[PDB]
Amino acid sequence: KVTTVVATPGQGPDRPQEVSYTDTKVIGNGSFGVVYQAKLCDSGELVAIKKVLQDKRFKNRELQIMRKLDHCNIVRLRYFFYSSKKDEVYLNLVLDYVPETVYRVARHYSRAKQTLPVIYVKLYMYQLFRSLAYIHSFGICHRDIKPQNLLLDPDTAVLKLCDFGSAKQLVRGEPNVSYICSRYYRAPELIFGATDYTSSIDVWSAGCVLAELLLGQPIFPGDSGVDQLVEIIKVLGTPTREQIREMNPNYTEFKFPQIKAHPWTKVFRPRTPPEAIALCSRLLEYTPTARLTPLEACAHSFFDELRDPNVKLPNGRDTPALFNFTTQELSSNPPLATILIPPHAR
Template sequence: MANKRMRIRSADTVFSHQMWLISFKVVGTGSFGVVYKAKLSSTGECIAIKKVLQNKRYKNRELQVMRMLTHKNVILLKFFFFSSGEKKDQLYLNLILEYMPVTVHRVARQYSKLQKAMPLLYVKLYTFQLFRALAYVHNIGICHRDVKPQNMLVDPETAVLKLCDFGSAKQLIIGEKNTSYICSRYYRAPELIFGATNYTNSIDVWSAGTVLAELLIGQPIFPGDSTIDQLVEIIKVLGTPTKEHIQQMNPNYKEQSFPCVKGCPWSRVFGVGTCPKAIELVSLLLVYTPSDRPTPLSACAHTFFDDLRATECKLPSGRAIPSCTDFSAEELGNEKQLAPLLCPRLSEFSCVDALSITGSTLSASLSRSMPASNKFPPPNGTDTSAGL
């Protein structure tokens, strides 16, 4: 792809203008198309260009979804343009995105090759920012549907993470059927394997739970070779799902008998030396009943991430970690009772004025958010964003 002068459109306006794109280099390929690294000649800024063939038989919502998204942990769409292919009637969508150097998948592989565990600080930072990104996209009614380490971009110097690839993303509407053959296999929620078509945003929560587990053990926790084998891998850990579990995952599933398998204790799955709080969080995320999984924001409030809320927390380089306490009122949405857990230092709580959390209101919010164990705020019970 040579240097090109293109007429491109800004992601947040209807205006278009000419711009030179230079120094093209292929940095990624896949079933979706090709990703290039390039520069904007006017500023010298590095950008990524995702070039995707538009298939008339497949509804591509990526541009529509990405124009809705503006969040520190979601890859930013800057511009876009359409281009013709070599064959007649071929049309490509080109998304001009902010550039991030590496994926979490590649970072994790580097540690695996060295036979080292990823430092727990990075596990916390990457998964916290993933949950924060999911909380944002779910709050505006979008389900990502392909959460995996390959779709988590990071800057190794700053440890900032951004969720990317919204090619499978969709607004889930109650009563509207969706395809169950979605999400990469290792990270696919069990209700999808059982053929559910009326699933909720909690499929993303399951995927995020498998990512957390993978970063802790250094390999996928459920490495199935096929759809059936994927279910077998899940059953090895969680045990055989009950009739009630299956009913909750897919009420239309035709009952089949499964061999009775007892679940494996989480302590044995992870082994000696794994952070107990991390194991506890995984055990809450990876459950059969979708409505029993915590919301992404509740996951952010888990004690596993408490270190990230401390002022003295630094990267090994001495650099400050990405801020983990600057939640806005928009981000908190209908879970404002979590504010005292997510933003423990009110001086750093950017939405205090908007929420009017003071005195007894703050105390009441805290008591509502903490269960008897004082370890984990209760999930909402149902995914309130599923019907948006």
């Protein structure tokens, strides 16, 4: 069937308009809601429609958040609309469809017993850090960074961050739930029960993604909340009293056996690019404030090849847009712009 709705532009404005779409099929079902794929009649362009049950006298966090965003590495909100079980209200997020994920790409190499080419590791991570730099600049923390939430256009290698269903605009002093983020990517402060954490939890999760791309498997595969810390301790060792205070000031453990960190160079297979390991060690820190900011990560030596005039994908194609920074995106450290934007890009 062809389906016609009255919908509001994502950005917008903001004047409701008629939108028609067809070829509606389910591509996901969860405790959050349902996701459909569809085709826009006027355009031909494919879209994902995320349908969520909505408390009619409450505002939706994800919507409010999605409306603020416009960035080449974030999934675009094209439209939103409501339905109508009788008195029941659903909010529908109409998103640009993206066929692949970093998960399903890394899984393909992992099953073929091989590692993702270094160049893609640079491309995906760099675009990830950019999306973080952008959302963090509004004070928005994603709270669910993982490979499944990193969409990929397999031809252009454009990465788009998706799934803001856990996202929140963080306000200091106002506490946030600790049981958040997928377990494998959950920062240690969260496991320790922090309610006063920051956007740097996303950087930790970004480190786990990086490490995972390097190992061909999750670096910290905890079987449970407690086991997740066991897994972290195997690599980082136990945290110092000062690191514990920095993660959660309201947590005290007077007595515990101290364990030294495992060397980073032995965590990864011997041929792992040393610069990838070096970057990893500055993301996977216990001390939340010692982690690199996303912008700082973007400027790391590891992404130097991306700044080289002559860089190409293995498929011969040019790389996607990497250097189109905005003042919003650079706001945490505006001077870094002259390093992030190479001379050949101005």
